[PDB]
Design a protein around this ligand. Structure first.
Ligand SMILES: *[C@@H]1O[C@H](CO)[C@@H](O)[C@H](O)[C@H]1NC(C)=O
Ligand SMILES: *[C@@H]1O[C@H](CO)[C@@H](O)[C@H](O)[C@H]1NC(C)=O
Ligand SMILES: *[C@@H]1O[C@H](CO)[C@@H](O)[C@H](O)[C@H]1NC(C)=O
Ligand SMILES: *[C@@H]1O[C@H](CO)[C@@H](O)[C@H](O)[C@H]1NC(C)=O
Ligand SMILES: *[C@@H]1O[C@H](CO)[C@@H](O)[C@H](O)[C@H]1NC(C)=O
Ligand SMILES: *[C@@H]1O[C@H](CO)[C@@H](O)[C@H](O)[C@H]1NC(C)=O
Ligand SMILES: *[C@@H]1O[C@H](CO)[C@@H](O)[C@H](O)[C@H]1NC(C)=O
Ligand SMILES: *[C@@H]1O[C@H](CO)[C@@H](O)[C@H](O)[C@H]1NC(C)=O
Ligand SMILES: *[C@@H]1O[C@H](CO)[C@@H](O)[C@H](O)[C@H]1NC(C)=O
Ligand SMILES: *[C@@H]1O[C@H](CO)[C@@H](O)[C@H](O)[C@H]1NC(C)=O
Lengths: 147, 414, 198, 50
């Protein structure tokens, strides 16, 4: 800052920094809930089970950007890797859904070639799974000069 | 009359946008900066923001629908053959390489970095005010796989795999069928196959020089990227407007005035920011309509020129259309149209009909052309003179009244 | 003013007409190739499906019927004044939209007057603000509505111009086999004529 | 079956618009005019006119 600067503004004209009046140090201000959060569900008539997708953050520091120390009690199970359900995607990560290797037809689009659906053939009958969508199947037609 | 005696093979390249970027907005972060006494005032305005969210969600769904409609045409991907012995035609430049570092062909690699998708950065200012960008559903690897399955499958199975099952056919016989579909016989192919292959191989290679050194050939596809960035940058700068209030910051108003005098100046900021959001949604809808029209044109071009041979004049290329090759591009598609154009010409004297011994004779699929000594018959698109027989002509009527008829004999094989 | 004056558009149409007749349709796909007009018409008749026999035996009848079918357009255009309404409403809409925008300046928008001079000469600087902001917002809204309607009309005209461009590309310098794309019966040839804004 | 024995040649006229008139506007003389007291006030509304 300048020697007489007291607060710093942004291009959209809001304070993102301030100088503490007692101890002359600089502090940053950011919104305490910024960034998108998406909830993936089947129908409410179907059994209630949701998955939470964080948009553009890594998922080794979800509790940093969600402030788990003051969030509600039922939100802590969607911000930790106690169960094997937190896996990282290209469009963020999914909490509450298990990954599958077999490709299917897309049901609930998520992004970056990853979809979701209710139920599985693995036992799991109420948990929702996440998979990579399929674009068809291999055919491998053969070429010859006189056929 | 003028009839060509030679021809050349050219490759034409055009681009057209297919989809644009998907965006999302949050009113409770844009209109108010985490002010619990601004959310209550915003709540008494109705369901404008649900309308904006539904409009933006519809645009985002339509953007994925466009790229699903354009590229997904076969629903059965074909494995790329390791050999490229297609009768002398080199398909290595438009097909993905074996043991490839990047999962796409060389031409779409060369045009991927030709366009650019991209500390007081504007991205953090957009993120702090609820402006986010959603990734597309189909990644570029699947689009490259779709284009590769179209290419390997157009070359090794003809155009018939787009209407029914795939039929195996040699490449040269397909070339003869397409040449016959132009109007010229399947004679200039088999007698000049090496010339056709050698001219096609460097007509393909000239696209590398036409795309690498020369710029501004993908400006239509760069403007789509630029417009979203300009519209998002001009929206975050409207937050620094008074709109008739004492300040552009809600914290300056709320800390300096009591609660009763606060609404009369908060309302002006709320109305101005709502008007800015209305405007942004309006040009987003209009641009989405234009992109939808362009994507429909790209889809019908994909259907009619890659999966078949089109007889419509100047729909895919300049001259007589033979085939097309699709190439993946960021937010668009690139078409490589192979056409047939005649090059040289030579003057000739022609006649409408020939009266042999009182009966007129008219040609079929050709014209009457003499070379200086006697008369022949030849096709219009290539100078291939043939002797006039009774099979090349048909008797019809009398020769007493035909404008410009001449006297000549007709060969009888008996 | 437009960049292309009407003389240059007329020159473009004349260069299309002289070149469609003396060189066939092949001038647009490659170089121009010379061909007599009777042989070109016989080739087009063969492209319809009828053999190239009914032309050479009836050429005078074809010419005589073409020459007065063309001349009937003189009576079809000179008397009737409803064929170019699609070309006249485009002219009318811009004039109506420009005239209705200049008449919005005579509205109060909740202020004491529609004139800035009446407000500024009767009120001090502190309370002229709240009554000039209403006029500013009303005039800004009046401009924004006009811009949005102009954008929508521009999209419509762009679609119509794309249709005109593909019709010119497929029917003037080519013969189209699509049903009812150019005419009613079996298409033989087309001739473009320049028009104001169309 | 029915087969024609004669034919006629017709000329069809169809019209369609290509372009409209180009227009331009100036905010500073539409919203205010020559009043400099409200030019500064229009300056506080942002970049709508751009
Ligand atoms: C203000 O007073 C506090 C209390 O002792 C002290 O810690 C701080 O250093 C002071 N700041 C000054 C003198 O700038
Ligand atoms: C849930 O779905 C079942 C099966 O269609 C239906 O019978 C039931 O009525 C639904 N529940 C409600 C509350 O409508
Ligand atoms: C997320 O993790 C990846 C790999 O661990 C790293 O490359 C990237 O920089 C990380 N992003 C952030 C925002 O920390
Ligand atoms: C699924 O794929 C992953 C990654 O390729 C692999 O580690 C795993 O063994 C596979 N099978 C199962 C059942 O997860
Ligand atoms: C036709 O043009 C090609 C390319 O210039 C040339 O190689 C060939 O010899 C030409 N044909 C004749 C008959 O001259
Ligand atoms: C095809 O083009 C590549 C490009 O370098 C070349 O190496 C190759 O020899 C050409 N021919 C074949 C049959 O691959
Ligand atoms: C054909 O004749 C025209 C004039 O009648 C002439 O301009 C043209 O050059 C001639 N073509 C050739 C190939 O000599
Ligand atoms: C015309 O063709 C005939 C038959 O091929 C040939 O004998 C004659 O020399 C040719 N004349 C010219 C001028 O090319
Ligand atoms: C063709 O021959 C007939 C008689 O054999 C003659 O009357 C007629 O004039 C000739 N036509 C031409 C064009 O020389
Ligand atoms: C066909 O119609 C034209 C125009 O009415 C007429 O002149 C001609 O005689 C008709 N043909 C026959 C065979 O009647």
């Amino acid at each position: 800052f300048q020697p007489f600067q007291q607060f710093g503004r942004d291009v959209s004209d809001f304070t993102d920094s301030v100088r503490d009046p007692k101890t002359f140090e600089i502090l940053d201000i950011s919104p305490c809930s910024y960034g998108g959060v998406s909830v993936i569900t089947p129908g409410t008539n179907t059994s209630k089970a949701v998955a939470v997708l964080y948009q553009d953050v890594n998922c080794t520091d979800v509790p940093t950007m969600i402030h788990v120390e003051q969030v509600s009690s039922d939100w802590r199970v969607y911000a930790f890797n106690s169960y094997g359900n937190m896996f990282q995607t290209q469009a963020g990560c999914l909490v509450g859904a298990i990954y599958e290797n077999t490709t299917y037809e897309c049901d609930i689009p998520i992004g970056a070639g990853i979809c979701a659906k209710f139920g599985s053939d693995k036992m799991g009958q109420e948990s929702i799974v996440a998979y990579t969508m399929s674009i068809g199947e291999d055919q491998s037609i053969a070429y010859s000069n006189n056929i | 009359i003028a009839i060509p005696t030679n021809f050349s093979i050219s490759v034409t390249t055009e681009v057209l946008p297919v989809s644009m970027t998907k965006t999302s907005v949050d009113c409770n972060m844009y209109i108010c900066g985490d002010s619990t006494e601004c959310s209550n005032l915003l709540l008494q305005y109705g369901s404008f923001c649900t309308q904006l969210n539904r409009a933006l969600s519809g645009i985002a769904v339509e953007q994925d629908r466009n790229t699903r409609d354009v590229f997904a045409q076969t629903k059965s991907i074909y494995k790329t053959p390791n050999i490229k012995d297609f009768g002398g035609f080199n398909f290595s430049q438009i097909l993905p390489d074996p043991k490839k570092l990047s999962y796409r062909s060389f031409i779409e690699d060369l045009l991927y970095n030709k366009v650019t998708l991209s500390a007081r950065d504007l991205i953090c200012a957009q993120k702090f005010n609820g402006l986010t960008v959603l990734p597309p559903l189909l990644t570029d690897d699947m689009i490259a796989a779709y284009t590769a399955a179209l290419i390997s499958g157009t070359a090794t199975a003809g155009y018939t795999f787009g209407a029914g099952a795939a039929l195996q056919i040699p490449f040269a016989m397909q070339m003869a069928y397409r040449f016959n579909g132009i109007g010229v016989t399947q004679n200039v192919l088999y007698e000049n196959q090496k010339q056709i292959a050698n001219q096609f191989n460097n007509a393909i290679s000239k696209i590398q020089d036409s795309l690498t050194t020369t710029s501004a050939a993908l400006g239509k596809l760069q403007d789509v990227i630029n417009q979203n960035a300009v519209a998002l940058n001009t929206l975050v700068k409207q937050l620094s407007s008074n709109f008739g209030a004492i300040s552009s910051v809600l914290n300056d108003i709320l800390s300096r005035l009591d609660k009763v005098e606060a609404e009369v100046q908060i309302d002006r900021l709320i109305t101005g920011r709502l008007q800015s959001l209305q405007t942004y949604v309006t040009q987003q809808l209009i641009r989405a309509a234009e992109i939808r029209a362009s994507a429909n044109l790209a889809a019908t071009k994909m259907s009619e020129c890659v999966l078949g041979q089109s007889k419509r004049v100047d729909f895919c290329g300049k001259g007589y259309h033979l085939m097309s090759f699709p190439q993946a591009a960021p937010h668009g598609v690139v078409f490589l149209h192979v056409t047939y154009v005649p090059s040289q010409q030579q003057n000739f004297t022609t006649a409408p009909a020939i009266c042999h011994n009182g009966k007129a004779y008219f040609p079929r699929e050709g014209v009457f052309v003499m070379n200086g000594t006697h008369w022949f018959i030849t096709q219009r698109n290539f100078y291939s003179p043939q002797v006039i027989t009774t099979d090349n002509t048909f008797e019809s009527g009398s020769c007493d009244v035909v404008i410009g008829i001449i006297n000549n004999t007709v060969y009888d094989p008996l």
